[PDB]
């Protein structure tokens, strides 16, 4: 007779490209059917890439120009309130200040997922956030979220600046290329390959969230909304007549890409 685990893991992928919001959503899903447990899990891994889209947005003439740049990236999961299913774990579990996050997720047998006596589910979460932090947004049993926010940046060997830096002469110097350059304003922004790659290429989330469902529940079909967000600031530069001066407007634009996914706990499928 069978003395192994009594667990099966079924894994698939849904991928969507949102052209308009420059987002490549790549969701992996893994149903964990531990037949020795009255509940049944689902791990939803949110990867892909949210493009940074660091670009000259506005030009008022030679002497003023604005640059849209990404101040934060967000991923949010949300079950509706009427749904029977619940959130039981998430990864990262807490804020992350290091430049890399990495965790290998295993199943430890009583609706328990950890980051010998373990079932591998085949997920090693990994991402990078040079110059940014990860903040966990107040989780509940129906909602969880991470925001990856800008924190800090050296500019051509000049002192780390951030979103609120101020100098009475040059103002906020975050993406100021030169203090006295005789180019036009649109040409006076820092080359994006001198900053974090999150500003140019963008951010590639790799978060996980574990959802649990009672076997004994007449409705075995759950909806869930997944949101990928990009928040952009407006970094302006103008000529004062003797130099460049920068200003930074926080959170002026928010690009948001939402999708509702359908979970079928009997078929162990998740559809677009």
């Amino acid at each position: 007779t069978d003395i192994g685990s009594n667990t099966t893991v079924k894994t698939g992928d849904l991928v969507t490209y949102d052209k308009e919001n420059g987002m490549h959503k790549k969701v992996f899903y893994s149903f964990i059917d531990d037949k020795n447990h009255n509940k049944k899990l689902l791990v939803i891994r949110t990867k892909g890439t949210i493009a940074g889209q660091y670009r000259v947005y506005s030009e008022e003439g030679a002497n003023k120009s604005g640059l849209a740049w990404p101040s934060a990236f967000k991923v949010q999961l949300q079950l509706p309130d009427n749904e029977v299913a619940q959130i039981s774990d998430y990864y990262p579990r807490n804020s992350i200040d290091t430049k890399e996050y990495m965790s290998t997720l295993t199943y430890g047998f009583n609706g328990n997922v950890t980051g010998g006596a373990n079932v591998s589910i085949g997920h090693t979460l990994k991402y990078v956030q040079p110059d940014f932090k990860t903040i966990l947004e107040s989780p509940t049993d129906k909602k969880v979220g991470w925001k990856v926010i800008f924190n800090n940046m050296v500019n051509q060997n000049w002192g780390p600046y951030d979103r609120d830096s101020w100098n009475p002469v040059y103002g906020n110097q975050l993406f100021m290329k030169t203090r006295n350059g005789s180019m036009k304003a649109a040409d006076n922004f820092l080359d994006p390959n001198k900053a974090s790659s999150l500003l140019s290429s963008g951010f590639s989330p790799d978060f996980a969230t574990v959802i649990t469902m009672d076997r004994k529940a007449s409705k075995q079909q759950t909806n869930i909304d997944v949101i990928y967000e990009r928040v952009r600031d407006d970094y302006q530069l103008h000529w004062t007549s003797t130099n460049w001066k920068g200003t930074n407007t926080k959170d002026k634009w928010i690009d948001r890409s939402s999708e509702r996914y359908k979970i079928d706990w009997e078929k162990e499928e998740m559809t677009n």
Partner: antibody
Amino acid sequence: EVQLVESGGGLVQPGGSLRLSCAASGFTFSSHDMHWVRQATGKGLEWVSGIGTAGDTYYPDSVKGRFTISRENAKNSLYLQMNSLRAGDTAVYYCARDRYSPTGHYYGMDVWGQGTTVTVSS
Amino acid sequence: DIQMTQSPSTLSASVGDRVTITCRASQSISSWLAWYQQKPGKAPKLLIYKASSLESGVPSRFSGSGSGTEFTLTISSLQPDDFATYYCKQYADYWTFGQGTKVEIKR
């Protein structure tokens, strides 16, 4: 202990020139913006000139073209060359240090000297 | 050429009083405003930066508020050490001090 000591200054005929200096001690001089600020007897503080950590200089219109601020990090000392003085420039002249956060937040003029008096008159 | 006007220019108060000084800029300066205390024949001390943030040494009875054009400094419970002159200073665009406000002793 952090300290700034102004010196130079005294009587000058209107039209004449003069040179203040400031010795700084107890911190890394080269890494702070520095200012001169003046105060005529009985009156308010008036910003006179500033100099950035990279040697870039800043002036209000009241002195522009007449005063020059300078820096000499090797001697931990700040200077003010005052030309074409007038009665209006009569005041006590202080030396002051800016302080910033590690990420470039400006606190303000953090530490001041005791001042040195300049009197411009016939 | 940002003018700063403080008001009132003189105010009298006794210990315990809650005094408020006002500073007005001739154009917007966001929240780039600082406050200094000065006593006779001494050098100024920095009290407040970014219109409401307290400099490290400074007693918590001091506090500040404002944005744009009008700013106030407030001493919640005046002490003997607080009778002095106070100066606001704008740093949105170079530096400008207000003309000063003397807090005198009422009798």
